């Protein structure tokens, strides 16, 4: 009670290290139980002097149904997103473009 309660934690393995070879190389630990034999990865840490940019390859969405109302990705970094009411978080640019 005479000092602040400083702590930190991670969920299960989100924030881990290395793992086996993936699909496009990427010996990185995929959390949540994502199979690395079916999951490519991309990352901008290490190329800190290049202003990295990238665009995906038109992943095909299934027919609409009210039972799967989400499209989800994994982030692992600092990303710019809007909060519930206006407020921001610095991060970096990541968006999803329909079509």
């Amino acid at each position: 009670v005479d000092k602040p309660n400083i702590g930190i934690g991670y969920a299960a393995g989100t924030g881990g290290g290395y793992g086996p070879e993936g699909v496009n190389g990427s010996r990185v630990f995929l959390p949540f139980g994502l199979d690395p034999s079916r999951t490519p990865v991309m990352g901008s840490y290490g190329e800190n002097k290049l202003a990295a940019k990238a665009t995906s390859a038109w992943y095909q969405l299934p027919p609409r149904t009210p039972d799967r109302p989400l499209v989800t990705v994994a982030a692992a970094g600092a990303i710019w997103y809007y909060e519930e009411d206006g407020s921001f978080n610095y991060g970096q640019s990541l968006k999803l473009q329909w079509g």
Binding site: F32, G33, L34, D35, R38, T39, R68, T72
Partner: protein
Amino acid sequence: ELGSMVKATVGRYPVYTVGSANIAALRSAGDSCAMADAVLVEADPNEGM
């Protein structure tokens, strides 16, 4: 301190509130779980890729 709960329950319905769980438990006579019905989980998160 009563409106800050009655409004939070009437608004935001269903979505999930500590009052909506109790209302559902009253209506269902006590065989409807409170938060295991709102939370949606995803087993095998590589079959949705």
